[PDB]
Design a protein around this nucleic acid. Structure first.
Length: 993
DNA sequence: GCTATGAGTGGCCCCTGTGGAGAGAAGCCTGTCC
DNA sequence: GGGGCCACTCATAGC
RNA sequence: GGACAGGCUUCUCUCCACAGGUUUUAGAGCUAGAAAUAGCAAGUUAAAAUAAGGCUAGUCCGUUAUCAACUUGAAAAAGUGGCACCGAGUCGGUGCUU
């Protein structure tokens, strides 16, 4: 016999609960076979459990980092182009100058040429640093001076301008000197110097004791920390404000501080508002000044100007040669794209059209067609004729509200739609019914004070074209629709002019000019072919044609597409693409929402599949779920379950799908006092799923209440933590100063971290158990070892490619290949007395046990927690308060059970003693305060990584397991997604000494 | 008589600020419809 | 939020 | 239940850019003193990297999504685990079957 049963599911963002119940609300328990090598061949478990998983992450960070990488690469390319231009003349003066510039980052030992970059000699370098303390001084000198200067200084100025060209927020162009920016920066530098001198003098004169801390201590927020340390400008002002208030003569300095102008640096974050035109002007001035000496400058002047001005248009996209999934550019010729010949290579119009169209939705009724623009004339025709199709009007002498004819529709559109941007009900009644039809009293139904459809595009074309006859000609419909498409697709005036150039023959200069200024945004939901492309086989009328005039039927779009006597429904059904059934992964990915809920849905579906496999492949009667997205989950479940068609090819619904809301179950809990505390454990998800299933089955349809109470008191529930292989950044991105340690990772292959510093704290991908021999001690004696080694994310490819060489690189010898066992994150281990630990990383463990607490304690805790906030009748409130007052001794029992559970699995003796001392010290506090503090206490034993918490005013820090050596002899557990299937492997029997 | 290793403990640490252009989805409000 | 790392004391044994 | 039409709000995906921050090196520190050190001077800028790198060599790609174990598979993927009853501190016992 197949015992009828149903599945209840609770779906969140981090957890998926599953419950299986029979017809009588009983939860069966089965005896399962256990694979492995241990003596435990059979384990009994209950058919209830919940799955926990890490929250899903979006793609924002990847997008930002990819954009940053592209920007850095393109800046490097600009610098390389500048150096390629200059190389010919630079070689004539100093051939090794470029070599010196590139290797300057290395230490003196690794440098191949002389250590001083600019000149290679100490005297000239000192002279340059003395005459020109800042690059802005050199910039102003080159702008104003009329003497032939060193080529290397010109290169430095041009490179400094190019590498920091500034923003492009504005198109077009925007001490009397042509370099206001450099002059302003030099003025700020001089003010900084003078103010620093004055500050030092005043501090030394009045308060000499603080001189050393302010001007020598790099560790504080003083001037030294503001310059050589990591102190920010705001922090420096914060620290220096009280000191200036303690001294005299600081009124000017204090006013400067209030304006954030005291001792201001040159390289400041306010530069984000500098237009690129200032840098362009300085560049052009320098080029003009120095072109009279260097022939190559004036010939390549426009190239240098373009390199600064050029940027890739955003609609074009990356200049990829086919092998990038993000690329869409159309490339005319296979030449190497350069900022000088960009115009002749890239089809700007085609690329822009591809960029716009690839995000446009396909027509749902006709998948192989694209929708029309929201401001398309044909779309506006469709909307207007659809609205006026169902309009009912009541005049004098009319018993029934009549329907408008096509002639009336055309007349009304011509009179008001083509003359008014929007047509209202009152305006219609006054202008057509009162004037044209000469009816004094007319009542219109279906439209609220204004028509939602309007001919805005027609009015724009009337304002611009100013020719009504050209607009009203059907022979122009193709040209007008193409014009509207062109206006919607592009935003660049140049491309708009280029494409409309073909139709410029029908219009004057000004008409073409104002057309170039119009833009439209938005798109419709139907395609051209659907509305007016396909024709009826008999009458030849399209959907639009019927909407214009349909006789007494006056059928709307929905009626036409569901009309059995017309071929529109036939064509729509025939056009349904019988494409490959989307893979459930990609099918779920096609949904709208955060990827986390998609992960939850996929896990839920796999849980359902495994449960069906467990129950002997006999499908349940009902599936209860709780969370459009819920509707899509229900659709997916129905599609996967009901798969057989009857003789009439109808859908055989062997399994019914149920959707429920949390409020009903919450009310059921409140009425029958089945309260839950979200902090005690994770069984609440399973209990909520069980309640969902029970309530659904009861609604569709003392024993039941007793059965529910018995079920909710079960201690054995299957909690499974889904293992995940960590991915992402190689390590923390904060570069740290050099230090003699083996834990640093180099930024580049040949950059020894001991001399350059680098990255720190790699993220562990996974660990593998290794049994081998390692030479330890000064005598290099072989020692057989057995330990866990964590593999970084950066080394995953090397490890997977050839594990043997990678392990030998670490010093391990005699590696037994078949003994390597991959252990993903959160792998489960079993210890003595049932104590369980989850492998968090290579060197840290997490608590892997769940506290089983009886229901009556949970009810008492809930009642005490909201003792003064009960929402119900006064009799119920007083009953609950009295019941709380009856059982004050439960607190001692709760503390005792917590102590026992801690002594059994937590092993936090110092923290447990602190907890006991705090509990004894605060035993006279109000009951509700006691409950509030005790609720926080369960964080100590909750599943997951240990965390700190507060108990009254005493704080208990987190207890961390800093050594994974105990699991080296434990029993490894592999659990299926529902945890019903297990495979247990004993690590102790492997790798004996 | 001296060191080395591991073992635990407590505490500190973690890249950030903005602009432009579009496309799409979803949640509410009104009207008509299948 | 949770894992990585450093400064410190200590356990413990080989020598 | 679904589709279209007007409005409010939030959220998601792709591209172009900018300003920083961090790191190493250069910017002769001087005086007295064996040195520890004491005093004085100065301090704003500059170059390169900004996930290791890869081959498809592009002015491209490298952090989202996908993953219990065993057999067959490059992988997507397919396949693999008795039942009923009585009990409950992480699940225990009893009866039939292979």
């Amino acid at each position: 016999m197949d015992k009828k049963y149903s599945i209840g599911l609770d779906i969140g963002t981090n957890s998926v609960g599953w419950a299986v119940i029979t017809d009588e609300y009983k939860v069966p328990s089965k005896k399962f076979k256990v694979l492995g090598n241990t003596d435990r061949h059979s384990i009994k478990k209950n058919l209830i459990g919940a799955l926990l998983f890490d929250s899903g992450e979006t793609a924002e960070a990847t997008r930002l980092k990819r954009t940053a990488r592209r920007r850095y690469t393109r800046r490097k390319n600009r610098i390389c182009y500048l150096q390629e231009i200059f190389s010919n003349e630079m070689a004539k003066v100093d051939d090794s100058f470029f070599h010196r510039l590139e290797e300057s980052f290395l230490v003196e030992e690794d440098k191949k040429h002389e250590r001083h970059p600019i000149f290679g000699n100490i005297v000239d370098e000192v002279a340059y640093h003395e005459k020109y303390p800042t690059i802005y001084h050199l910039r102003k000198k080159l702008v104003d001076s009329t003497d032939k200067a060193d080529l290397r200084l010109i290169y430095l100025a041009l490179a400094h301008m190019i590498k920091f060209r500034g923003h492009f927020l504005i198109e077009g162009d925007l001490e009397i000197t042509k370099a206001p920016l450099s002059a302003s920066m030099i003025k700020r530098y001089d003010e900084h110097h003078q103010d620093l001198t004055l500050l030092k003098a005043l501090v030394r004169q009045q308060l000499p004791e603080k001189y050393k801390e302010i001007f020598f201590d790099q560790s504080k927020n003083g001037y030294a920390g503001y310059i050589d340390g990591g102190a920010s400008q705001e922090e420096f002002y914060k620290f220096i404000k009280p000191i200036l208030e303690k001294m005299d003569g600081t009124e000017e300095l204090l006013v400067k501080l209030n304006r954030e102008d005291l001792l201001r640096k040159q390289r400041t974050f306010d530069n984000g508002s500098i237009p690129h035109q200032i840098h362009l002007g300085e560049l052009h001035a320098i080029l003009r000044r120095q072109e009279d000496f260097y022939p190559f400058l004036k010939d390549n002047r426009e190239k240098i100007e373009k390199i600064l001005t050029f940027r890739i248009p955003y609609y074009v996209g990356p200049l990829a040669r086919g092998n990038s999934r993000f690329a869409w550019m159309t490339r005319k010729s296979e030449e190497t794209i350069t900022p000088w010949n960009f115009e002749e290579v890239v089809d700007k119009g085609a690329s822009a059209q591809s960029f716009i169209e690839r995000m446009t939705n396909f027509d749902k009724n006709l998948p192989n067609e694209k929708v029309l623009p929201k401001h398309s004339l044909l779309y506006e025709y469709f909307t207007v004729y659809n609205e006026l199709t169902k309009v009912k009007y009541v005049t004098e002498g009319m018993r029934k509200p009549a329907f408008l004819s096509g002639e009336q529709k055309k007349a009304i559109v011509d009179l008001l739609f083509k003359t008014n941007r929007k047509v209202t009900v009152k305006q219609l009644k006054e202008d057509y019914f009162k004037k044209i039809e000469c009816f004094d009293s007319v009542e219109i139904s279906g439209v609220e004070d204004r028509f939602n459809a309007s001919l805005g595009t027609y009015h724009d074309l009337l304002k611009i074209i100013k020719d009504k006859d050209f607009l009203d000609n059907e022979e122009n419909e193709d040209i007008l629709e193409d014009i509207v498409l062109t206006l919607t697709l592009f935003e660049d005036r140049e491309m708009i002019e280029e494409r409309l150039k073909t139709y410029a023959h029908l219009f004057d200069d000004k008409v073409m000019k104002q057309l170039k200024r119009r833009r439209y945004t938005g798109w419709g939901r139907l395609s051209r072919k659907l509305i007016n492309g396909i024709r009826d086989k008999q009458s030849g009328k399209t959907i639009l044609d019927f909407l214009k005039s349909d006789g007494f039927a006056n059928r709307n779009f929905m009626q036409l597409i569901h009309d059995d006597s017309l071929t529109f429904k036939e064509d729509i059904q025939k056009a349904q693409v019988s494409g490959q059934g989307d893979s459930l992964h990609e099918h779920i990915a096609n949904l709208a929402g955060s990827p986390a809920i998609k992960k939850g849905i996929l896990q839920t579906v796999k849980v359902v599949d495994e449960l069906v496999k467990v129950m002997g492949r006999h499908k349940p009667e009902n599936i209860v779920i709780e969370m459009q997205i819920t509707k899509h989950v229900a659709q997916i479940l129905d599609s996967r379950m009901n798969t057989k068609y009857d003789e009439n090819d109808k859908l055989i619904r062997e399994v019914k799908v149920i959707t429920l809301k949390s409020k009903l179950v919450s009310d059921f809990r409140k009425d029958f006092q089945f309260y839950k505390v979200r902090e005690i454990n994770n069984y609440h998800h399973a209990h909520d799923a069980y309640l969902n299933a029970v309530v659904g089955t009861a609604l569709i349809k003392g024993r039941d209440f007793a059965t529910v109470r018995k079920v909710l008191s079960m201690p054995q529930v299957n909690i499974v933590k889904k293992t995940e292989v960590q991915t992402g950044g190689f390590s923390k991105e904060s570069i740290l100063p050099k230090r003699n340690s083996d834990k640093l990772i180099a930024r580049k292959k040949d950059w020894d971290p001991k001399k350059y510093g680098g990255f720190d704290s790699p993220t562990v991908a996974y660990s593998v158990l290794v049994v081998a021999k390692v030479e330890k001690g000064k005598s290099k004696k072989l020692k057989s070892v057995k330990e866990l080694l964590g593999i970084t994310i950066m080394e995953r490819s090397s490890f997977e490619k050839n594990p043997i060489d990678f392990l030998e690189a670490k010093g391990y010898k005699e590696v037994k290949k078949d003994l390597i066992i991959k252990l993903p994150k959160y792998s489960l281990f079993e210890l003595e007395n049932g104590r369980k630990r989850m492998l968090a990383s290579a060197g840290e463990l997490q608590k892997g046990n769940e506290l089983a607490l009886p229901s009556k304690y949970v009810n008492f805790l809930y009642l005490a927690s909201h003792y003064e906030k009960l929402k119900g009748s006064p009799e119920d409130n007083e009953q609950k308060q009295l019941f709380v007052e009856q059982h004050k001794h439960y607190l001692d029992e709760i503390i005792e059970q917590i102590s026992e559970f801690s002594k059994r699995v937590i092993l936090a003796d110092a923290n447990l003693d602190k907890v006991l001392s705090a509990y004894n010290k605060h035993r006279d506090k109000p009951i509700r305060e006691q409950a509030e503090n005790i609720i926080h206490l369960f964080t100590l034993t909750n599943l997951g990584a240990p965390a700190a918490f507060k108990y009254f005013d005493t704080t208990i820090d987190r207890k961390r397991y800093t050594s994974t050596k105990e699991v080296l002899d434990a029993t490894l557990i592999h659990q299926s997604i529902t945890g019903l299937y297990e495979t247990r492997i004993d690590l102790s029997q492997l790798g004996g000494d």
